[PDB]
């Protein structure tokens, strides 16, 4: 059960209308979030709507993938998280599907925080999936 499916999202930036964060959590492999371009970190988070115990994330990257990123959680109250905890990070990402597991943890929000690009564009995800 993908806990992210159709949940609310927020992003650091978007490339264009139609590339918003909600495109990463619609279950459609032919729609994507895409960030603005450049060397800045970029991010997308999902509000899971309730505390969940999570242990797996699946990312489906577009060609503009991250070689370095982290998966982070927040347990803040409300709808505007500010305190993030890294649960996983890599500097060897290879794009396409990234199937990530980590110690089971409570989370109300999950963030991809992307910090090194594979390309000179931005970052883009067809899908960002979250599982127990």
Place of tokens 């709507």: 49
Query: For strand 42-61 and strand 124-131, is the pairing parallel, antiparallel, or unpaired?
Result: antiparallel
Give the CB-side neighbour count of residue 105, counting CA atoms within 13 A. Answer: 20
CA distance 101 to 87: 9
Q: Six-digit token pair at 38?
A: 């450049």
Q: Six-digit token pair at 9?
A: 């999202």
Domain count, the chain: 1
CA distance 113 to 33: 14
Place of tokens 């032919």: 30
CA distance 117 to 110: 20
| CATH number, residue 114 | 2.60.120.260
Nearest 5 degrees, angle CA 11-CA 121-CA 68? Answer: 70
Q: Which domain holds residue 128?
A: 1-132
Residues in contact with 49: Cβ distance below 8 Å, sequence separation at least 6, in sequence order: 7, 8, 108
Would you call 118 exposed, middle or buried from its count of C-beta atoms within 10 A (0-12, 13-18, 19+)?
Answer: middle
Separate counts of helices (H) and strands (E) for the chain: 0, 7
Q: Which method was it determined by?
A: X-ray
Question: Contact, 90 vs 68, CB < 8 A?
Answer: yes
C-alpha distances (whole Å) from 21 to each of 45, 53, 92, 104 are 8, 22, 24, 25
Q: How many CB atoms lie within 10 A of CB 74?
A: 19
């Amino acid at each position: 059960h993908n806990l992210a499916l159709n949940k609310a999202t927020a992003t650091s930036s978007i490339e264009t209308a139609g590339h918003e964060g909600d495109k990463a959590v619609d279950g459609n492999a032919a729609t994507r979030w895409a960030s603005a371009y450049g060397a800045s970190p970029q991010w997308i988070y999902i509000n899971l709507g309730s505390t969940q115990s999570i242990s797996r994330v699946k990312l489906n990257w577009e060609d503009a993938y991250a070689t370095a990123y982290s998966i982070q959680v927040s347990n803040d109250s409300g709808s505007t998280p500010t305190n993030w905890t890294t649960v996983y990070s890599t500097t060897t990402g290879d794009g396409a599907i990234d199937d990530i597991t980590f110690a089971a943890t409570n989370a109300k929000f999950v963030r991809v925080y992307a910090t090194t690009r594979a390309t000179a564009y931005g970052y883009s995800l067809w899908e960002f999936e979250v599982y127990g």
